Amino acid sequence: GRLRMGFFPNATTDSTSTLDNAIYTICDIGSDNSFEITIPYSFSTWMRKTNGHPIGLFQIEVLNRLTYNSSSPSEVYCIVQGKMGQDARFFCPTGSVVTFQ
Amino acid sequence: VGNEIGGNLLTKVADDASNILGPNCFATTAEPENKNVVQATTTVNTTNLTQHPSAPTMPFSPDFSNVDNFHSMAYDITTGDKNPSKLVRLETHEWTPSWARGYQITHVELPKVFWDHQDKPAYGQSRYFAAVRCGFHFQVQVNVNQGTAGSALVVYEPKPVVTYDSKLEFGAFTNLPHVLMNLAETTQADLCIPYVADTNYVKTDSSDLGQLKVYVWTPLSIPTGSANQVDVTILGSLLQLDFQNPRVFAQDVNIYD
Amino acid sequence: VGNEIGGNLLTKVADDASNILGPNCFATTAEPENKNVVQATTTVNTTNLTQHPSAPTMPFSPDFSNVDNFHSMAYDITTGDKNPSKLVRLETHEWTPSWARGYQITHVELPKVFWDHQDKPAYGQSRYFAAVRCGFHFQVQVNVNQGTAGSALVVYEPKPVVTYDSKLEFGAFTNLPHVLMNLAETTQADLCIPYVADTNYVKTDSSDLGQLKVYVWTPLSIPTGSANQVDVTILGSLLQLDFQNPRVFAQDVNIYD
Amino acid sequence: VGNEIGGNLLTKVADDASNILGPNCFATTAEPENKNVVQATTTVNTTNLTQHPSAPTMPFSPDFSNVDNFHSMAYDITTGDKNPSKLVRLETHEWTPSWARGYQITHVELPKVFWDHQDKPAYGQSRYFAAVRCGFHFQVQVNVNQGTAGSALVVYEPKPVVTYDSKLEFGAFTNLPHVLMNLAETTQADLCIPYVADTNYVKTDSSDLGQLKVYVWTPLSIPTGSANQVDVTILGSLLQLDFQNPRVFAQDVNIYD
Amino acid sequence: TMSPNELGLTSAQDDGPLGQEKPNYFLNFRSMNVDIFTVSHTKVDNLFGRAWFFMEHTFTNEGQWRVPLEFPKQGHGSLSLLFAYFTGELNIHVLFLSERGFLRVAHTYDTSNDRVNFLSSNGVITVPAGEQMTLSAPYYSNKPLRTVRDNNSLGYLMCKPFLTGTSTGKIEVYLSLRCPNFFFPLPAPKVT
Amino acid sequence: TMSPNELGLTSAQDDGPLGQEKPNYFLNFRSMNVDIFTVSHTKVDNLFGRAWFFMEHTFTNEGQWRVPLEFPKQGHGSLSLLFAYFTGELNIHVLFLSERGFLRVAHTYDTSNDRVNFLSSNGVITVPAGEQMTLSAPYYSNKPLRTVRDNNSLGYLMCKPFLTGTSTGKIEVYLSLRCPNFFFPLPAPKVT
Amino acid sequence: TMSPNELGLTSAQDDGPLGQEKPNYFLNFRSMNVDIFTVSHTKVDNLFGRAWFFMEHTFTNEGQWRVPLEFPKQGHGSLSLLFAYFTGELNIHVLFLSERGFLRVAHTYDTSNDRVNFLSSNGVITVPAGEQMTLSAPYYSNKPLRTVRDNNSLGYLMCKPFLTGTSTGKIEVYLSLRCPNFFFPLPAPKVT
């Protein structure tokens, strides 16, 4: 099956919307079932608050129903990971907003 | 060895026992047309990942130049592209003779005015992007018969100025890109304004780029017989335009913190 | 990178920490013996397509020359092949002395006569093919004691002639490949006939190639005491044979329109 | 051709129709990270076969030398390895003065004595192997004050001798690697014994390598006041050790026929 | 040597792009090209260079005759139905069957009926009664390509006869083309 | 050219070894590095080179104060919790809030309480009342590496004040490190 | 380096052709060849070069004795049963146990009984009473190869004794072959 995951940078309205104009990636199930999507830096400012405005709207819509057979699952599990790009940078160290353990 | 090795043995064994007529058998082994590969295709801000690709097709001896050699449309190929930067009428107003010095004739929200109506060349694209970075080229036109006289102040006011407008001393606005244009002398003013803001990019459909205004330097001195309906028009062109952030159709997106 | 890369890392990492004794681990990665390939084998007018082939086998240090170095069979290796072109008895008939000039002694359907009976060397192959293109070498033999005399006309008649035989003037048949053979002088006649037809190929088991005949040039003048039973025999050999169209066993197939 | 060929056509077709801006599409095809390969890994007497391997992992910029550069343990790196060959106390006995010439003082089962108790350096490994081939270095120590006198016969007796011991003439045992050591003169005897047997290897936990013994050459002549408790100690070191046959933990295995 | 692909083992989903002259073999078989004539009869220029009946008109008076010209779904010209677009010279064969008179003939791709009222500007070659002419109409088409199927794929033909007395008759028409440019072959047609 | 692997299509089970700086692209995207300052604020030496509050102690008498020093789960120093082992110089910032007196300060990694009884051998820099000092304690650790988490990951700090009269006060402490050596990054911490 | 194929991972369906001397390894193992004798005892010429009992016959008179000679399913010669065809010299060891006389011995592959009536033409070496001879019969076989199994795989042996008086006895026979040519090894035999 296929699955299209898009991303509207800097979006705030949490609502399902056509991803035709959003940065999307179509995922066709095969041997390498891990799919990546990059969001390039998008903000008015040169640097952006670490804990400020959202990164954007993340949506993963179904493109083609997950097919199966007598001995295969009718539904599967998915995991979403996140990391910084090779051009990632952090700038000013500020106070803390939370306490770890 | 094996199972790859078979075309050779059969082809050879057939070869060894061959007589005058020749071999009575030929065997060839190779990889299937449908191999275990993965194809990836990327269009504008999109990436299609397929792990079960097939040989792409196309018409006979096709021509993808897509350019009409006959030019049934005699326009620059990049016409549609540059169209949004086209010069357009941003505003029109009729100066009233009674108006005092320093009065604001008319003003235009910058830069969202270029998408003022759905009939604006730039309105189309402006919808699909939340961020904008552009330069302007204004042409404020004011026509008045020779008998009459007067002067207007065409000046560009960045958000900073527009914000604190009342705190600024009129008569000093000449410090901003302006054009004291003396009527009966000039019928049009030209202003080239680059991207000016305290942020790298300005939210589309916003007035953050500041706004162009037209003030009354010296009220209109219209003689008795002379006409009394003077119109002030503001035209705008985009020296350079740049839409970056993608977004839903005309949906308010915050590029700011 | 990966999953191909592992033999090297394990083999290397094992390598890096190695001490005096040596490495304590070796890892090698490669492709399985059973790879994703396709094999194709073609024999006479056949093609076997297999997408799941396996390593072909064969006996120890085998010899596929298939030729008996001792020649327990002292025959030319191509004996079986040429066998069908072998000379054979196509017909035999006893000329009757009473017969008038121009009478037809005997005739043989060409070329289907070479497959006249299942005891004909060419009968075997002729069954598995519908089309034929061949050359002939006839040897009509007629023996008569010296005391007697006479003459027979051995002539080849293509389908055209055989068709319109009654419309042709006897005595002019000498225009066709023939052998006026005067008895008491010659005991055998030789005729080399190439493929003659209005079509590139002739249907197997057909008379389209025409037929060889033997006529009475001048009746037999047999003296009183002399014998009166003269036999006429027709032998045939194939200078060159060619069976092309495949077909079921002895099934009438139409090569013509 | 196909399905491998697609990155090029799409990449090219995209390429051909490209204008000033550039191509509007790029396509690349290749093999998946998870290819059809097989990995094999071998450790000491082991072989792991995997047909569905994955890219091996490891920490950041790792160091597999595994050697502590600070030597928090100031010992030879091969200490643990050689440990089992270490010199150890195999036996101790108190010679009794009354004993007659030729009397057997003490004896040690060879080579199973080096694994005499679970407190023997070699006991550990000796458990995991059924076959052994080694050399010995004995050091029989006997201390006696100067006032006293006497002599003992330290001799190595292979299985052959041990078997037929009563059939051999004492006083001739000097033919075997021995050390007639005269007390009051020598306090220790040294014997270097190589692997001696009628079989290439000896079963571990067996006396097949023969046994070292200590006899009474001449009884102890202990004066009145002198001490009367003389102890005889047997120390053993492995010049060279070799454990080959693998086996369950300390399970009797027959290497012999 | 020969690959299994050329021995029959292939995949239908790997045929694109369109137009793959792949060779097919077996041990006793090889593509053998034999020509029976000095030239090809399959070439578009040759095949179509030969006319084929179109239609007939019977005239009892001078009234003008305008008929849409289209490709045949009937003669050997039907081979054109395998294509989608056409462009090039058009050979029109007209036979004037009459006792005494003249036949004005003209051709235009222009759809407007009025443009044909004044026939002279268009062309109007003259075939005396009892004579037949073959006029080659150029591609004066306002459209770069002519969908090959259209009821007017080919431009309209005009026939007006300048009769003299009560004489009447019939005008048979045949069509052929000079060097034809066909593009984008479409699926084969069905039968009626 | 670009492979499908660098276009997003990959396999999570083929990531080892750890640390793969693989580039990710699309037609309109390329990794662009832009620096806003003349140097990095992500480098361990720089980030940690800046102190952060630790704890405060109020003293009404000279009694000695010994406190385990550990990495913060509170300030920007929390970024250390992403590592497992540490080793290097340790900058201790102490503020002596008092009217009239002196503050003895010393640092040791030694767990034994008794070793700190005679403070002078250990160090004991002197901060006069109303003054603040920044002493850099070396890695006199009996352990090659300091698990970064331990309630005593960092060595113990000793503060004894030589007061003169009834005067009392409070001693605030801040910590920072000079050039830190972190190893074997572990999973990110949870929140309270 | 070493491939996974040589480490144990293989496929039984990819063994053909027959006879693959593939090497098998592990980290502490390598094929080590050690020879205990100056020559091989596995070579066909050597092994079979050593005789083995066949059968015994007791004779009370001169009557001739003909016995089919076949390969043993009993002694070390059984190793021949692993083959299908044989050809080469045949060593026949005969012992004549008698008091006073002579023993005529002859060998022929000819199946006809009559050919052996006149023994002299065939051979008939003479072993005096109490003596034993070893005659090497050539491959005078009318068949290029001798199926190794046949009850007469080896040619028939003839023994006729020219006794003198009432004397009687027994003739023990042993067989061996000189340089044997075996072909097309077949599956191992079963046990009784």
Question: SS3 for G45-103, per residue?
Answer: HHHCCCCEEEEEEEECCCCCEEEEECCCCCCHHHHHHHCCEECEEEEEEEEEECCCCEE
Give CA C250 to chain center in angstroms.
Answer: 15
DSSP state of G13: G
Counting Cα atoms < 13 Å in the Cβ hemisphere of A12 gives: 11
In whole angstroms, what is the distance from residue D233 CA to residue D217 CA? 16
Distance CA D146, CA G180 (A): 81
3-state helix/strand/coil string of F77-111 = HHHHHHCCEECEEEEEEEEEECCCCEEEEEEECCC
Count the Cβ atoms, other than its own, within 10 Å of residue C157. 20
Structure-token match 């005396």, residue found: E128
CA dist., res. B68 & res. B60, Å (int): 19
For chain D, the residue count is 257
Residue with tokens 């309105």: B123
CA distance G109 to G101: 27
Q: What are the Cα distances from residue D154, in Å, to C211, D105, D157, D176? A: 119, 10, 10, 10
Residues of B in contact with F27 (CB under 8 A): 42-45
Distance to chain B for F2, nearest Cα, Å? 10
Resolution in Å, one decimal place: 3.1
Instruction: Name which of C89, C98, C42, C128 is nearest C230 in CA terms.
Output: C98
| Of E26, E112, E115, E101, nearest in space to E62 by CA | E101
Q: How far apart are CA A69 and CA A76, in angstroms?
A: 13
Residues with Cβ < 8 Å from D253, sequence gap 6 or more?
D130, D203, D204, D245, D247
Cβ contact D130:D247 at 8 Å: yes
Tell me how long chain F is.
Answer: 192
CA distance B57 to D6: 9
* Calpha distance C165→C157 (Å, rounded): 9
> What is the largest distance, in Å, between two alpha-carbon atoms of chain C?
122
Give yes or no for B44 touching F (CB within 8 A): yes
DSSP tag of B192: E
**CB-closest option in E1, E10, E18 to B60:** E18
Min Cα separation A17/chain F (Å): 23
Chains touching chain D, criterion 3+ CB pairs below 8 Å: A, B, C, E, F, G
Strand duo F154-161 + F102-108: pairing: antiparallel
Chain B residue nearest residue E6, CA to CA = B28
CA atoms of G138 and G109, how far apart (whole Å) = 10
Nearest neighbour of A90 by CB, restricted to F23, F25, F41: F41
Q: What distance in Å separates the CA atoms of residue D247 and residue E81, rounded to the nearest whole number?
A: 85
Judge residue D220's burial from the number of C-beta atoms within 10 Å of its C-beta, 0-12 exposed, 13-18 middle, 19 or more buried: buried
F142 touching C (Cβ < 8 Å): no
What is the DSSP code (8-state) at residue D161?
H
CB contact under 8 A, A87 and F191: no
Assess E187–B contact: CB distance below 8 Å, yes or no.
Answer: no
- Closest by CA to B216, choosing from B108, B100, B94, B93, is B100
Cα separation, G188 vs G79, in Å, equals 9
DSSP 3-state of C6: coil
Can you give the residue ranges of every domain in chain F? 1-192
Give the residue from chain G lying closest to C14, CA to CA: G27
Among the listed residues D203, D232, D37, the one whose alpha carbon sits nearest the alpha carbon of residue D144? D232
The shortest CB-CB distance from B60 to any of E13, E27, E185 is to E185
Q: What is the dihedral of CA B226, B227, B228, B230, to 10 degrees?
A: -120
Strands C188-193 and D46-50 come out as unpaired
Residue A34's closest chain D neighbor by CA? D33
Chains E and A touch (3+ CB pairs under 8 A): no
CA distance B210 to B200: 14
Taking the C-alpha atoms of residue E178 and residue E45, their distance in angstroms, rounded to an integer, is 7
Question: Which chain G residue's Cα is nearest to B13?
Answer: G17
Q: What letter does residue E61 receive in the DSSP assignment?
A: S
Chain B: give the shortest CA distance to residue E188, in Å: 16
Which residues on D lie below 8 Å from A31 (Cβ)?
A: 32-34
> Tokens at residue E50, please?
């030969």
How far does CA C233 lie from the centroid of its chain?
A: 23
Q: Are B35 and D5 in contact (CB under 8 A)?
A: no
CA distance B7 to B28: 4
Question: Number of Cβ pairs closer than 8 Å across B and G?
Answer: 10
Q: Do C9 and F14 touch (CB under 8 A)?
A: no
Which residues of chain D are within 8 Å of residue A30 when distances are taken between CB atoms? Answer: 32
B3, G13: Cβ pair inside 8 Å? Answer: yes
For residue G1, give both structure tokens: 């380096």
How many residues comprise chain A? 101
Question: In angstroms, how far is CA F165 from the centroid of its own chain?
Answer: 35
Question: D30 near B38, Cβ under 8 Å?
Answer: yes
Solved with: X-ray
In whole angstroms, how far apart are CA B104 and each of B140, B153, B175? 14, 9, 17
Query: Minimal CA–CA distance to B108: which of B233, B12, B201?
Result: B233
Closest residue to B41, CB basis, from D21, D27, D31: D27
Chains D and B touch (3+ CB pairs under 8 A): yes
Q: Give me the sheet containing G169-180, strands edge to edge.
A: G52-59, G169-180, G88-97, G132-137
Taking residue C183's Cβ as centre, other Cβ atoms within 10 Å add up to 22
Contact flag E27-C44 (C-beta cutoff 8 Å): yes
What's the rounded Cα separation, in Å, for the pair E153 and F101?
A: 111
> C67 in contact with E at a CB cutoff of 8 Å?
no
Listed residue (C36, C230, C218, C206) closest to C110, CA to CA: C206
Check if B8 contacts C (Cβ < 8 Å). Answer: no
Give F16's contacts in chain C (Cβ within 8 Å): 2
At B151 the three-state DSSP class reads strand
Which residue's structure tokens are 């340089």? G179
Is there a contact between F11 and A34 (Cβ–Cβ < 8 Å)? yes
Judging contact as 3 or more Cβ pairs under 8 Å, the answer for E and F is: no
Task: Please tell me the distance from the alpha carbon of residue G16 to that of residue G18, in angstroms, as a whole number.
Answer: 5
B26 → closest Cβ in E14, E17, E27: E27
> 3-class SS at B92?
strand
Q: Say if residues A32 and B38 touch (Cβ distance below 8 Å).
A: yes
